[PDB]
Amino acid sequence: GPVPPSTALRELIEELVNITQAPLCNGSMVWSINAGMYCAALESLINVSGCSAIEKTQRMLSGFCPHSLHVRDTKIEVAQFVKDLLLHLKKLFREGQF
Amino acid sequence: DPFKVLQEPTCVSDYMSISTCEWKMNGPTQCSTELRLLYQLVFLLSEAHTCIPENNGGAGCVCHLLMDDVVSADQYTLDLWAGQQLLWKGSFKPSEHVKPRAPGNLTVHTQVSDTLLLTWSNPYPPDNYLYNHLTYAVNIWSENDPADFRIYQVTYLEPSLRIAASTLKSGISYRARVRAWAQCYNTTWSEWSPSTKW
Amino acid sequence: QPPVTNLSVSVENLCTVIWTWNPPEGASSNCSLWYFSHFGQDKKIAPETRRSIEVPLNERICLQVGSQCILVEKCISPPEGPESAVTELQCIWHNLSYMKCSWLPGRPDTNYTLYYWHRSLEKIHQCENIFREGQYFGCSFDLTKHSVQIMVKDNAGKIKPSFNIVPLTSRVKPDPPHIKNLSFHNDDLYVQWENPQNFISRCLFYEVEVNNTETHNVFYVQEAKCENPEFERNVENTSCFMVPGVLPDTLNTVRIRVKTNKLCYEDDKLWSNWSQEMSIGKKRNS
Ligand SMILES: *[C@H]1O[C@H](CO)[C@@H](O[C@@H]2O[C@H](CO)[C@@H](O)[C@H](O)[C@H]2NC(C)=O)[C@H](O)[C@H]1NC(C)=O
Numbered sequence: 050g051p052v053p054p055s056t057a058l059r060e061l062i063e064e065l066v067n068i069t070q071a072p073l074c075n076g077s078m079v080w081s082i083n084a085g086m087y088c089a090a091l092e093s094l095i096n097v098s099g100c101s102a103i104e105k106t107q108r109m110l111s112g113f114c115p116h117s118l119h120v121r122d123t124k125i126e127v128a129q130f131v132k133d134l135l136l137h138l139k140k141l142f143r144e145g146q147f
Numbered sequence: 148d149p150f151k152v153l154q155e156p157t158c159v160s161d162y163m164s165i166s167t168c169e170w171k172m173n174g175p176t177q178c179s180t181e182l183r184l185l186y187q188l189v190f191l192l193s194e195a196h197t198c199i200p201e202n203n204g205g206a207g208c209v210c211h212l213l214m215d216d217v218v219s220a221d222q223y224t225l226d227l228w229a230g231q232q233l234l235w236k237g238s239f240k241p242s243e244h245v246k247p248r249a250p251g252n253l254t255v256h257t258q259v260s261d262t263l264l265l266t267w268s269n270p271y272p273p274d275n276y277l278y279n280h281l282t283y284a285v286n287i288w289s290e291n292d293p294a295d296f297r298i299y300q301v302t303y304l305e306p307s308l309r310i311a312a313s314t315l316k317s318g319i320s321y322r323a324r325v326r327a328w329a330q331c332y333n334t335t336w337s338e339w340s341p342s343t344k345w
Numbered sequence: 346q347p348p349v350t351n352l353s354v355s356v357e358n359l360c361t362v363i364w365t366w367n368p369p370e371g372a373s374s375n376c377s378l379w380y381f382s383h384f385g386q387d388k389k390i391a392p393e394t395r396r397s398i399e400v401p402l403n404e405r406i407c408l409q410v411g412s413q414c415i416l417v418e419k420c421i422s423p424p425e426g427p428e429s430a431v432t433e434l435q436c437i438w439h440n441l442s443y444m445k446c447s448w449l450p451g452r453p454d455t456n457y458t459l460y461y462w463h464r465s466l467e468k469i470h471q472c473e474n475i476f477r478e479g480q481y482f483g484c485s486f487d488l489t490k491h492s493v494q495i496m497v498k499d500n501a502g503k504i505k506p507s508f509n510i511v512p513l514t515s516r517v518k519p520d521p522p523h524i525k526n527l528s529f530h531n532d533d534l535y536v537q538w539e540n541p542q543n544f545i546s547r548c549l550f551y552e553v554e555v556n557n558t559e560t561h562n563v564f565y566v567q568e569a570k571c572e573n574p575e576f577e578r579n580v581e582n583t584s585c586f587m588v589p590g591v592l593p594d595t596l597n598t599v600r601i602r603v604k605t606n607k608l609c610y611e612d613d614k615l616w617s618n619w620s621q622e623m624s625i626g627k628k629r630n631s
């Protein structure tokens with residue numbers, strides 16, 4: 050759109066930092082991506098059940114992906130999923146990418 | 148009655164709770180009776196909502212689409228209901244048309260060194276994204292001579308401004324209002340706060 | 346689904362605790378071999394017959410392991426002496442050049458050694474640049490642009506070793522910035538400074554102070570995007586702030602400060618040192 054690109058990801062970051070601060074989401078396990086997409090991170094989250102604490106983030110992630118994963122290997126906790134994603138987006142933010 | 152939309156519905160978002168959509172029909176109307184505004188978050192797992200529009204000029208109307216919160220990606224299906232008949236199907240991205248809430252609780256206080264201190268309140272809670280990204284504009288002008296004006300630019304975090312009274316007439320009375328915008332979203336300015344005089 | 350055979354705990358590097366085991370031996374079935382492991386909390390399901398965790402050893406730690414598609418528990422303990430251990434062990438990555446760690450004693454006359462390791466080091470290294478500031482013992486090693494492991498013990502056993510994992514996205518204290526010039530334009534003061542070497546404005550958060558007898562003013566700026574190419578020079582390694590409502594008739598004195606925000610790294614509230622001061626305006630020679 051007509052808004053600066055940095056601001057999108059900027060918001061995503063601040064939310065995760067904010068969310069990582071009830072810890073988190075009854076611990077429901079999700080498949081990791083241990084790059085690739087924002088979609089991979091999306092389709093592993095929208096599997097969570099009644100954890101509305103992570104709702105906004107899901108919507109945020111769905112904006113990085115245009116309109117059932119690909120290599121189901123491990124399955125960590127949500128908090129550990131988020132904590133791990135957070136510092137990766139930080140890297141891209143320092144790198145000034147997308 | 149050829150019911151028609153003479154002006155395509157425009158919309159802006161406070162990026163908090165309320166959005167504002169305005170449109171103009173091709174003739175006088177009672178929207179509280181005739182028009183309905185159905186909007187749905189295209190985060191599909193999500194329910195459509197009805198909006199009861201209010202008259203906005205006897206031939207124009209406005210509705211307020213209530214919301215829990217909003218994020219950049221968020222997008223909405225908009226449909227304008229009469230009756231059953233058409234028309235408007237529309238998409239809306241609150242992120243694209245941010246219209247920040249107006250700042251408030253503006254006062255003036257007398258400090259040492261014959262300096263003046265103006266203060267106001269950030270219209271958002273610390274949790275809200277805009278909270279840290281609001282740069283203000285203070286507008287001080289004389290009523291006597293509206294030509295004798297002054298405009299300041301506030302880019303810091305503390306919603307405050309201190310100036311030297313030596314910049315006033317020492318004589319006349321002044322009115323002053325502030326407004327805000329987020330440079331991070333390239334938004335239109337807010338509404339001017341309730342002007343003060345001292 | 347029987348339990349896993351012979352769970353083993355091994356410490357790699359400084360504090361990389363590594364649990365290992367063999368499959369359930371035996372069934373065969375068709376339900377594929379799959380493993381789940383707790384903490385004391387920290388849950389994980391995987392096929393691998395091992396789990397590697399990075400954690401301090403200032404306490405005991407137990408992994409329990411099941412099998413599905415009954416839990417076995419093996420644990421590691423630290424070596425102790427416990428009240429004989431360093432208090433308030435802390436590190437800071439200075440300007441992304443060198444790491445500076447300090448500690449206090451535990452509540453004889455004893456010598457401390459600090460060791461450190463991280464991702465790209467063929468050996469655990471021992472720090473040699475020790476220092477003393479009042480009641481404090483400390484070290485400084487070079488570290489130039491993941492996590493770093495730090496432990497400190499005694500030269501002659503005796504004391505319970507003390508561990509510390511430094512994330513490397515926190516504990517970053519940038520060097521102080523440098524004011525490049527002060528200017529006026531119809532009573533708007535413009536301040537233009539230079540951020541420290543290895544930082545881009547985008548990652549920083551600013552504090553400007555201004556002094557006007559006395560009036561200690563201080564601002565907090567989220568972003569200092571710089572766009573007046575008339576009342577500045579432009580080094581584009583440069584950031585700029587405008588202090589409105591100041592008159593040229595008085596002498597204002599300016600300093601700048603900086604710290605990494607919540608993006609890029611953490612907001613550990615680690616302000617750099619103050620910049621050297623720079624003044625503008627009409628003086629008064631009392
Ligand atoms: C800030 O963002 C605004 C809005 O995106 C930019 O204004 C747009 O300018 C382009 C041409 O540069 C026009 O085609 C668009 O119509 C404008 N956007 C809309 C939809 O209103 C503006 O250029 C940016 N301002 C700065 C200083 O970059």
Ligand SMILES: *[C@H]1O[C@H](CO)[C@@H](O)[C@H](O)[C@H]1NC(C)=O
Pocket residue numbers: 250251252268270
């Ligand atoms: C002052 O006005 C603001 C903005 O309308 C409002 O949020 C706030 O509740 C008011 N603060 C006080 C103490 O009333």
